[PDB]
Amino acid sequence: NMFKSKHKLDFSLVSMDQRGKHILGYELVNMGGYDLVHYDDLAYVASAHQELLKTGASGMIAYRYQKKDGEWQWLQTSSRLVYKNSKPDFVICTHRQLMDEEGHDLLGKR
Amino acid sequence: TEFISRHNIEGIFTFVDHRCVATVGYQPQELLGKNIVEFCHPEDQQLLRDSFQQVVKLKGQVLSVMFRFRSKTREWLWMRTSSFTFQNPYSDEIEYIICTNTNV
């Protein structure tokens, strides 16, 4: 139920595990990092993005990502800044696919 | 009673949540790809257009505009739309404009 993705500092996707591609139903590159974020989770994801940029790490306990068929996928994600020659280079995310029950339970705790 | 829509900086619908079906009578796919002003009463369009341009200019500030929205039943529905641009936390580029569209 776990997979990884790699992103520019602005969170646009540059690569993702094939397992993550099949969960979301998709290409997935050539897309902005916020185009699939559920509108009720935009603030939550943007706040984690700032945590990642200022701190080098962030955690999102639950948020929704729109799948190809239009349905929402609940996700739980850790993010980390990867550096290169002492400068921020890219972002690596580790995701866990959440069922809707656990996602809605975590939504109220986030 | 409201629904959320996302727009590019020109006003084109790029996402609409399904609450639009009950609020204004269209399916989301009927709105996607059209400009918001195409659903606006002719007398209200200039105010809508300038409000949308100002949302983009005042990156991040939340603005409000009232205008008549043309429902699928071909009635003019008075709408209050709260809008803001979402800025990318790294690049500060405008990703899109978020509108909360409420029948009044």
Residue numbers in the entry:
A (entry chain B): 269 to 294, 298 to 381
B (entry chain D): 361 to 464
What text comes from the article?
The aryl hydrocarbon receptor (AHR), a member of the basic helix–loop–helix (bHLH) Per–Arnt–Sim (PAS) family of transcription factors, plays important roles in regulating xenobiotic metabolism, cellular differentiation, stem cell maintenance, as well as immunity. From the N- to C-terminus, AHR comprises a basic helix-loop-helix (bHLH) domain for DNA binding, two tandemly arranged PAS domains (termed PAS-A and PAS-B) for dimerization, and a transcription activation domain12. The ligand binding site of AHR has been mapped to its PAS-B domain. Here, we present multiple crystal structures of the Drosophila AHR PAS-B domain, including its apo, ligand-bound, and AHR nuclear translocator (ARNT) PAS-B-bound forms.
To characterize how dAHR PAS-B binds mARNT, we determined the crystal structure of dAHR PAS-B in complex with mARNT PAS-B. The crystal asymmetric unit (ASU) contains two dAHR PAS-B and two mARNT PAS-B molecules, which form two closely related heterodimers with a rmsd of 0.34 Å over 212 aligned Cα atoms. In the heterodimer, the two PAS-B molecules are organized in a roughly parallel orientation with a total buried surface of 1160 Å2. dAHR PAS-B:mARNT dimerization is predominantly mediated by hydrophobic interactions. Three hydrophobic residues, Y305, Y310 and L313, of dAHR PAS-B interact most extensively with mARNT PAS-B. The side chains of R366, N448 and Y456 of mARNT PAS-B form hydrogen bonds (H-bonds) with dAHR PAS-B W343, D278 and D306, respectively. Interestingly, all the observed H-bonds are facilitated by carbonyl oxygens rather than the side-chain atoms of dAHR PAS-B. Of all 11 dAHR PAS-B residues participating in the interaction with mARNT, 9 are conserved in mAHR and hAHR, suggesting that the AHR-ARNT PAS-B interaction pattern may be highly conserved among these species. The superimposition of apo dAHR PAS-B on the heterodimer gave a rmsd of 0.78 Å, indicating that no significant conformational change appeared. Compared to the WT protein (380 nM), the binding strength of Y305A to mARNT was largely decreased (1800 nM), while it was only slightly decreased for Y310A (500 nM). The superimpositions of dAHR PAS-B:ARNT with HIF-2α:ARNT, NPAS1:ARNT and CLOCK:BMAL1 gave rmsd values of 1.4, 1.3 and 5.8 Å, respectively, indicating that the overall structure of the dAHR PAS-B:ARNT PAS-B complex is very similar to that of HIF-2α:ARNT and NPAS1:ARNT. The C-terminal tails of HIF-2α and NPAS1 PAS-B wrapped toward the interface, making additional contacts with ARNT PAS-B, while the C-termini of dAHR PAS-B pointed in the opposite direction.
